[PDB]
Amino acid sequence: FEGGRSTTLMRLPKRGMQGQVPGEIKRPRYQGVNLKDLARFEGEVTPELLVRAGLLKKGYRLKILGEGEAKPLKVVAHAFSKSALEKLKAAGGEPVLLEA
Amino acid sequence: VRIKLLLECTECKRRNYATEKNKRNTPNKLELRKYCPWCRKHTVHREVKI
Amino acid sequence: GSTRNGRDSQAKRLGVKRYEGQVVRAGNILVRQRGTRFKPGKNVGMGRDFTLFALVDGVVEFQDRGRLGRYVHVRPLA
Amino acid sequence: PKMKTHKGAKKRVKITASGKVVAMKTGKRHLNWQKSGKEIRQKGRKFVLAKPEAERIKLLLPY
RNA sequence: GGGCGGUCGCCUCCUAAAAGGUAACGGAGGCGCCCAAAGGUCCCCUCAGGCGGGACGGAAAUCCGCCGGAGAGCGCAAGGGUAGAAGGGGGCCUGACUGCGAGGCCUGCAAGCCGAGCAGGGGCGAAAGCCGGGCCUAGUGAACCGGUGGUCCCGUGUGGA
RNA sequence: ACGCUUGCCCGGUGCCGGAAGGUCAAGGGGAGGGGUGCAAGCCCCGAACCGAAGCCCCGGUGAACGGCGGCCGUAACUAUAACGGUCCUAAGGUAGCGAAAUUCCUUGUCGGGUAAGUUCCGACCUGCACGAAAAGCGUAACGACCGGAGCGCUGUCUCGGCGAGGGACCCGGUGAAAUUGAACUGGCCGUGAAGAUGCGGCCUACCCGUGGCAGGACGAAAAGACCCCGUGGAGCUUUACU
RNA sequence: GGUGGAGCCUGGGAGUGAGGGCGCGAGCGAUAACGUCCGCGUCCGAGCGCGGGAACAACCGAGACCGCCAGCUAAGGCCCC
RNA sequence: GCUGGGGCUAGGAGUGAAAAGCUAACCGAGCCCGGAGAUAGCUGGUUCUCCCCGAAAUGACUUUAGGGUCAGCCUCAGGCG
RNA sequence: UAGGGAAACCGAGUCCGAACAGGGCGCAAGCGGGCCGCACGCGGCCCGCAAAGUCCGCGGCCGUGGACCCGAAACCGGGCG
RNA sequence: GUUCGUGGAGCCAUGGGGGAAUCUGGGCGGACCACCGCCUAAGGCUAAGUACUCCGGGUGACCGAUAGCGCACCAGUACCG
RNA sequence: GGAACCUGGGGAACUGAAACAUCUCAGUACCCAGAGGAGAGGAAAGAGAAAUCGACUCCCUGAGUAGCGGCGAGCGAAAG
Ligand SMILES: [Mg+2]
Ligand SMILES: [Mg+2]
Ligand SMILES: [Mg+2]
Ligand SMILES: [Mg+2]
Ligand SMILES: [Mg+2]
Ligand SMILES: [Mg+2]
Ligand SMILES: [Mg+2]
Ligand SMILES: [Mg+2]
Ligand SMILES: [Mg+2]
Ligand SMILES: [Mg+2]
Ligand SMILES: [Mg+2]
Ligand SMILES: [Mg+2]
Ligand SMILES: [Mg+2]
Ligand SMILES: [Mg+2]
Ligand SMILES: [Mg+2]
Ligand SMILES: [Mg+2]
Ligand SMILES: [Mg+2]
Ligand SMILES: [Mg+2]
Ligand SMILES: [Mg+2]
Ligand SMILES: [Mg+2]
Ligand SMILES: [Mg+2]
Ligand SMILES: [Mg+2]
Ligand SMILES: [Mg+2]
Ligand SMILES: [Mg+2]
Ligand SMILES: [Mg+2]
Ligand SMILES: [Mg+2]
Ligand SMILES: [Mg+2]
Ligand SMILES: [Mg+2]
Ligand SMILES: [Mg+2]
Ligand SMILES: [Mg+2]
Ligand SMILES: [Mg+2]
Ligand SMILES: [Mg+2]
Ligand SMILES: [Mg+2]
Ligand SMILES: [Mg+2]
Ligand SMILES: [Mg+2]
Ligand SMILES: [Mg+2]
Ligand SMILES: [Mg+2]
Ligand SMILES: [Mg+2]
Ligand SMILES: [Mg+2]
Ligand SMILES: [Mg+2]
Ligand SMILES: [Mg+2]
Ligand SMILES: [Mg+2]
Ligand SMILES: [Mg+2]
Ligand SMILES: [Mg+2]
Ligand SMILES: [Mg+2]
Ligand SMILES: [Mg+2]
Ligand SMILES: [Mg+2]
Ligand SMILES: [Mg+2]
Ligand SMILES: [Mg+2]
Ligand SMILES: [Mg+2]
Ligand SMILES: [Mg+2]
Ligand SMILES: [Mg+2]
Ligand SMILES: [Mg+2]
Ligand SMILES: [Mg+2]
Ligand SMILES: [Mg+2]
Ligand SMILES: [Mg+2]
Ligand SMILES: [Mg+2]
Ligand SMILES: [Mg+2]
Ligand SMILES: [Mg+2]
Ligand SMILES: [Mg+2]
Ligand SMILES: [Mg+2]
Ligand SMILES: [Mg+2]
Ligand SMILES: [Mg+2]
Ligand SMILES: [Mg+2]
Ligand SMILES: [Mg+2]
Ligand SMILES: [Mg+2]
Ligand SMILES: [Mg+2]
Ligand SMILES: [Mg+2]
Ligand SMILES: [Mg+2]
Ligand SMILES: [Mg+2]
Ligand SMILES: [Mg+2]
């Protein structure tokens, strides 16, 4: 309440779509994770492990994405970025996507 | 206001507009104009009734 | 028997904003002027409302001398 | 009970990571005719000064 | 004091105390617009008046010569500035462009204004260079709900709407 | 109550009547389009046209709401209007009253009443701003209504006095009340929020009471009953909204 | 030059948005108001703590940490209270 | 006409020879309970001690001027020096 | 712990845009620092519980709840007269 | 009614008007069309887990006759209406 | 008839939006009906995207999220 006048919040417009009366479209999302950060531990890294290691809240799917050096090991994910393919490509073999 | 007839100039082939008036009182009827679009690179432009 | 005229305009607040002997950057307004009381010299550009600004950075100087108007000279540093 | 997010604020402004509040500029939506390419074009997410300490208070639980 | 009357926004000058700001039911006035040219570039010319005359002509129509440095004009009230053009005349055009915009004036915030320069593609000029409207300050209205075109971004299981 | 009357205009509004005509809802009808599907099919729109009440339009209605003017010239100076020309005009107040429960100027003017009358009575009309059923003018009787005058008589007064009873005063008995910062509480002149017992200067005043006056303590009662504010709350009105 | 309850940046926390007096520069008023409204500064508010002006917030001096039967001074006075 | 006894009429309602009178000593919409600890930007009050610093009554806006949001003035903590 | 963008989508980059022009968001900038691993690019180390955040306590403030307290004129529901 | 206030407005019940079919029949997956998935409405019943304390008892950084329930006492009593 | 609770049928106003009529307060207080030691609901013409779960009730989450709203005040799930 900025006095009886129009507040600064009300004077500036709005941009995004509010949505329809059913709500939002429940689509899955992606979670970028740094390849200088999950390169600590070792093994054929998958879900059910990285969601237990402290990161990766038990929800939507992930993708490996960071600015740093990596370790040569296997990794199974759903997506990869157009630089982490090359930073991970150094002695690294991976499937680019799961069962879908 | 009510003499200016504020309008917008159309692409004259596809899509865009240019938002400048043309008077109804003075006989400035059907004024051709070259202006800069985005895609078509300085083609001609004409009026619209809006 | 009422008040005939008691309104007044809000001031546009013109004036000299950068005096001489001041280090400036490229883009500083040297003077906000109503009419062109100051004429452009070296590295000085005018705008729409006769406002002149600096083109380069350096120590500015006024009054090269008269007979045509007051001068503003943005002089570069070497 | 638990406080409610101001939906007008959530639909109008967007708070960034380092505390800054990003919102659009005004004087653009209704009438845009007698304006230059500068005055049409320069609607470029102005910043708010000394009000975000009273503007991130209603962007509160989800930020 | 309230009521009656006047005013509620913007611009100009003074009050306003030689930076900026600054009040009163203080004084004097304007505005809710207009120009395809009254815009950009290039190229020519300098005004209003007074004197000596004229064929009508008010002492003002139109013409010549001298004096006249800005007392004219610059669309519009007032202020600033202007003939070493911004004023008057002619040719060609629409930059009365699109994406940005360094750095600033001012402001509590919201707003308002100047903007060198980069890219694309132009206009004028042989070029140097100018052009992101009008000599400038007033000519307007935040937000919300919707209308008309384009964008094909989302579109609620899937494909479309 | 009653005697004499209710004269002017239907333009605005209310009302009544209107098988001509304009507008308009739900609805009927539907050319022509849109989505989807291989199509068969399904779902959305949809302009023409028809379609009451109501509104608009015409007439009537004033013992329906409502109103009823100014201006220039003319008769032995004045005055006229009874006459001649205009209309924001629908229409310009007729009869009967009138400085009146109406009149601001005004205590208008004249006459009565008084020696003296801003009141009263009867006229004059110069009605800011009477008026015909929000009725107009009178009216025999009547009114704890109002205004004026006169008569015999009265302290009401000039101008007060005396007497009687119940209180007041004293004593015996019971014995509250609102108010209340503490007070050991003088006057004048100045100052102080601009009206001093308390502040400064001067003067007066032994302490404590009893009866009385109410000038002060801006004395008491009620958080001003007048005025203003509150985006306070209610009652009422309307062609303010729904 | 200036080490000061000076400044600059961030964050938390209030209060204030009825002001008034005085000198000057002003407007309105009547070159009237202990009148209204600004600016430049001070004071009161918040220093009704002190001395003087008889008494009195803004006229002058002075910025009260406390105590002492110590001095010197500011404004103002030296006939007596 | 006055009055006794038995009744009926009621709260946006009743009744009223019409004042907005009366309806259980107060009626321009009663009384009791509940919503309801309604609201009040409008008055008043707000309780132990000591120490340090210390305001403002200004500017920009508001169906708004006696109240507000931001800035100005103040304090605390952490940094610059 | 990665954020941009309205979303799609992309990601140490995103968006505005034809664009590596340009700009807005974040990014890495080094605190305790035996790190000399012996190449002065030192990669990164004993190592301050921190850049980096979470859980609990204790305080200031705030929102919803009556929210420092007292006090209305009134409104509605159910009834009593 | 569901968050759904008429918005693109589904579904669940319906006040009114029109109005069938019985698995090759229907409803739903948010205007709607096709595909693909879920379920049988227009009949009824159902313990257990959940709310509350007239009453019984144990506990309390709960109180100690102006506290605590209105009443520790012969209290919803005396008293008012 | 029963201190409180529950279901169904009606159902407000002050307040909040610093007025205020849609909205909030709130389907709350209040009125009526029946039953209970609980009531209601209940064996999918369900949910909603996974070819998945599998009656119903309650707590914590999801989450003040999606959404609704003079898009103001504010109200507010459901799936799992
Ligand atoms: Mg969150
Ligand atoms: Mg000045
Ligand atoms: Mg000055
Ligand atoms: Mg020009
Ligand atoms: Mg030139
Ligand atoms: Mg700004
Ligand atoms: Mg011009
Ligand atoms: Mg669907
Ligand atoms: Mg679909
Ligand atoms: Mg097919
Ligand atoms: Mg077909
Ligand atoms: Mg078909
Ligand atoms: Mg009688
Ligand atoms: Mg006597
Ligand atoms: Mg007796
Ligand atoms: Mg006695
Ligand atoms: Mg005195
Ligand atoms: Mg004394
Ligand atoms: Mg004395
Ligand atoms: Mg007496
Ligand atoms: Mg200080
Ligand atoms: Mg104020
Ligand atoms: Mg003030
Ligand atoms: Mg002042
Ligand atoms: Mg004063
Ligand atoms: Mg004075
Ligand atoms: Mg002081
Ligand atoms: Mg005193
Ligand atoms: Mg003294
Ligand atoms: Mg003093
Ligand atoms: Mg001291
Ligand atoms: Mg001495
Ligand atoms: Mg009786
Ligand atoms: Mg009632
Ligand atoms: Mg009634
Ligand atoms: Mg009646
Ligand atoms: Mg009574
Ligand atoms: Mg009453
Ligand atoms: Mg109360
Ligand atoms: Mg309530
Ligand atoms: Mg307030
Ligand atoms: Mg101090
Ligand atoms: Mg502040
Ligand atoms: Mg510090
Ligand atoms: Mg970038
Ligand atoms: Mg950058
Ligand atoms: Mg870091
Ligand atoms: Mg806390
Ligand atoms: Mg609905
Ligand atoms: Mg149904
Ligand atoms: Mg039905
Ligand atoms: Mg169906
Ligand atoms: Mg369906
Ligand atoms: Mg069944
Ligand atoms: Mg018990
Ligand atoms: Mg007790
Ligand atoms: Mg005791
Ligand atoms: Mg009794
Ligand atoms: Mg209940
Ligand atoms: Mg119900
Ligand atoms: Mg209400
Ligand atoms: Mg309210
Ligand atoms: Mg609700
Ligand atoms: Mg029973
Ligand atoms: Mg029962
Ligand atoms: Mg049980
Ligand atoms: Mg049960
Ligand atoms: Mg049951
Ligand atoms: Mg059952
Ligand atoms: Mg079954
Ligand atoms: Mg669940």
String of DSSP letters for chain C: ---S----PPP---EE-S-TT-B--TT-EEEE-SS--EEE-TTEEE-SSS-EEESS-EEEEE-S--SS-EEEEEEEP-
Q: Which nucleotides of H are covered by protein (CB under 7 A)?
A: 41, 61-64, 67-71
CA pseudo-torsion sign C42, C39, C17, D42: negative
For residue A77, what are the contacts with CB-CB under 8 A and spacing of at least 6?
A61, A62, A63, A64, A94, A95, A97, A98
Q: What's CA D14's distance to the chain center, in Å?
A: 6
A71 vs A81: CA distance, rounded Å: 17
Chain D residues close to A8, C-beta within 8 Å? 48, 51, 55
- Kindly determine whether residue A12 and residue D26, on different chains, have CB atoms separated by under 8 Å: yes
List the structure tokens of C47: 């705008």
Which residues is C75 bridged to in the sheet?
C59
List the structure tokens of D55: 């503007």
Please name the helix (run of DSSP H) or strand (run of DSSP E) that holds residue D39, with its range, or none: helix D37-41
Q: Looking at residue D54, what DSSP letter applies?
A: G
Judge whether D22 and D33 are in contact, CB under 8 Å: no
* A6 contacts chain D (CB < 8 A): no
List the structure tokens of A82: 């157009």
Centroid of ligand 24 to alpha carbon of D60 (angstroms):
42
Q: Which amino acid is at D4?
A: K
Q: Is C25 left (phi over 0), alpha (psi -120 to 50) or beta?
A: beta
Give nearest nucleotide to A2 (CA–C1').
Answer: H69
Cα atoms in the 13 Å half-sphere on the side-chain side of D53: 2
| Resolution to 1 decimal place, in Å | 3.8
How many C-beta atoms surround the C-beta of residue D56 within 10 A? Answer: 16
Q: Spell out where A24-97 has E strands.
A: 32-33, 63-64, 79-80
B18 vs D19: CA distance, rounded Å: 39
CA trace torsion A23, A29, A34, A39 (10° rounding): 130
Task: Tell me which residues of chain A, numbers 8 to 67, contact chain D at a CB-CB cutoff of 8 Å.
Answer: 8-16, 18
Buried/exposed code over A23-57 (b: 16+ C-beta within 10 A; e: otherwise): eeeeeeeebebebeebbeeeeebeeeebeeeeebe
Q: Spell out where B1-50 has E strands.
A: 33-34, 44-45
- Kindly determine whether residue B6 and residue D32, on different chains, have CB atoms separated by under 8 Å: no
Buried/exposed code over B3-36 (b: 16+ C-beta within 10 A; e: otherwise): eeeebbbbbbeeebbbeebbeeeeeeeeeeeeee
Which experimental technique did the depositors report for determining this structure? Answer: cryo-EM
For residue C33, what are the contacts with CB-CB under 8 A and spacing of at least 6?
C14, C16, C50, C51, C52
